Amino acid sequence: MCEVKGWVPTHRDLILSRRAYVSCDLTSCFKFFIAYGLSAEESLYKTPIGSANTLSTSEMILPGRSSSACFDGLKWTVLVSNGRDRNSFIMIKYGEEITDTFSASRGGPLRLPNSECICVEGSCFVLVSDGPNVNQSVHRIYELQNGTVQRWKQLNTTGINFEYSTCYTINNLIKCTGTNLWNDAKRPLLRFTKDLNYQIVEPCNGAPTDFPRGGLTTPSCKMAQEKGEGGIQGFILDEKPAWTSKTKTELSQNGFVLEQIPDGIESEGTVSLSYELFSNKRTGRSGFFQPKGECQRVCFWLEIEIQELSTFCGINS
Numbered sequence: 497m498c499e500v501k502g503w504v505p506t507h508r509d510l511i512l513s514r515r516a517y518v519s520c521d522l523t524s525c526f527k528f529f530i531a532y533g534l535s536a537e538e539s540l541y542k543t544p545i546g547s548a549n550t551l552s553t554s555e556m557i558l559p560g561r562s563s564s565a566c567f568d569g570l571k572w573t574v575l576v577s578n579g580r581d582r583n584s585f586i587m588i589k590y591g592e593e594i595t596d597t598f599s600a601s602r603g604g605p606l607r608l609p610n611s612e613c614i615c616v617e618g619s620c621f622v623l624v625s626d627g628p629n630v631n632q633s634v635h636r637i638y639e640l641q642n643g644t645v646q647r648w649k650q651l652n653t654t655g656i657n658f659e660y661s662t663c664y665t666i667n668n669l670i671k672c673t674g675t676n677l678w679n680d681a682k683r684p685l686l687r688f689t690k691d692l693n694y695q696i697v698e699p700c701n702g703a704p705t706d707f708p709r710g711g712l713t714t715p716s717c718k719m720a721q722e723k724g725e726g727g728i729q730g731f732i733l734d735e736k737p738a739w740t741s742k743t744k745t746e747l748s749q750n751g752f753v754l755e756q757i758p759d760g761i762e763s764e765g766t767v768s769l770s771y772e773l774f775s776n777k778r779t780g781r782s783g784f785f786q787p788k789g790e791c792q793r794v795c796f797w798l799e800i801e802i803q804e805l806s807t808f809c810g811i812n813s
């Protein structure tokens with residue numbers, strides 16, 4: 497059908513930025529990011545993908561410290577979190593209007609994933625996390641329409657933590673990669689549908705892809721507990737073939753390696769093809785985005801160190 501058989505690069509008064517990601521409308525793609533100062537408060541800004549982030553090129557959206565954004569074919573849905581603890585909240589804008597809010601249920605802070613949310617046939621889906629401790633975190637999928645919350649589903653994530661969710665959609669399934677900041681150096685995976693049925697699975701190989709992490713181990717569908725605490729946003733293309741991604745080694749954030757696994761992420765993890773990128777550059781967060789115009793496209797963004805996003809897109813059938 498539409499196997500991803502490789503990846504190619506597609507993009508290579510300054511505002512200081514963190515938690516950036518990419519999202520696209522029908523013609524163009526944007527960097528959404530949290531601006532926290534000037535190369536001489538915290539607010540979601542947006543900039544055309546070809547430009548540097550600067551007061552002249554970047555557009556302020558709303559105050560906040562995490563975010564998500566997605567285009568539904570008609571208008572932008574944007575979410576930001578702000579406030580603290582039990583008074584932490586998320587606000588949502590649809591086009592130019594603020595359309596909804598909700599507050600923390602489990603002690604806060606409310607946290608958005610800092611990757612694009614996923615719109616399918618006018619509904620948009622976003623993962624929201626809550627809870628003050630990574631060892632007792634709560635995660636919900638919120639379904640939106642026109643920037644208004646229609647419903648949500650809290651997930652059973654007992655025994656894991658699922659932060660920094662980065663998601664894509666193929667064939668009206670939505671698939672997200674999580675970062676476990678508590679007790680796993682492998683990345684938890686989420687699969688869900690427009691009806692909010694879902695499955696959470698663990699990679700069954702022996703090569704953890706979080707940073708920090710331990711060394712390689714025997715393949716199994718067990719969690720990789722060694723150096724499981726902490727983590728950084730990243731992605732796994734959860735298809736057949738699957739593709740994993742990680743720093744070159746567990747000792748350094750240099751480099752970025754992509755590995756193709758034809759039998760999928762729940763198999764023993766035999767690699768058929770690998771890439772090595774950015775060999776002597778420090779790399780950071782990574783996540784999915786999907787441009788909008790046969791097979792559905794999938795791309796990824798990656799922080800590189802002065803710290804900028806590069807983007808790569810998948811080549812299909």
Ligand SMILES: *[C@@H]1O[C@H](CO[C@@H]2O[C@@H](C)[C@@H](O)[C@@H](O)[C@@H]2O)[C@@H](O[C@@H]2O[C@H](CO)[C@@H](O)[C@H](O)[C@H]2NC(C)=O)[C@H](O[C@H]2O[C@@H](C)[C@@H](O)[C@@H](O)[C@@H]2O)[C@H]1NC(C)=O
Nearest residue numbers: 651652653654655656657658684685686694695696697698
């Ligand atoms: C809530 O989920 C937990 C853990 O489920 C496992 O990890 C999840 C993140 C997800 O990936 C699931 O697909 C995984 O199974 C589950 O507890 C686990 O249940 C399995 C058996 O179904 C056990 O083998 C496993 O030891 C257990 N893990 C832990 C950490 O407790 C919960 O289901 C269950 O509660 C436990 C205490 C058992 O009594 C079990 O019979 C009961 O169904 C699940 N809670 C609910 C209400 O479904």
Ligand SMILES: *[C@@H]1O[C@H](CO)[C@@H](O)[C@H](O)[C@H]1NC(C)=O
Nearest residue numbers: 628629630631632633678725
């Ligand atoms: C959860 O982690 C926190 C932070 O380190 C710790 O204070 C607490 O004891 C842990 N709680 C449980 C249930 O183990």
Ligand SMILES: *[C@@H]1O[C@H](CO)[C@@H](O)[C@H](O)[C@H]1NC(C)=O
Nearest residue numbers: 570618640641642643644646
């Ligand atoms: C969303 O706006 C559309 C216009 O595209 C309208 O037809 C629809 O009823 C709205 N849906 C909700 C849930 O408000």
Ligand SMILES: [Ca+2]
Nearest residue numbers: 676680724727
């Ligand atoms: Ca981890």
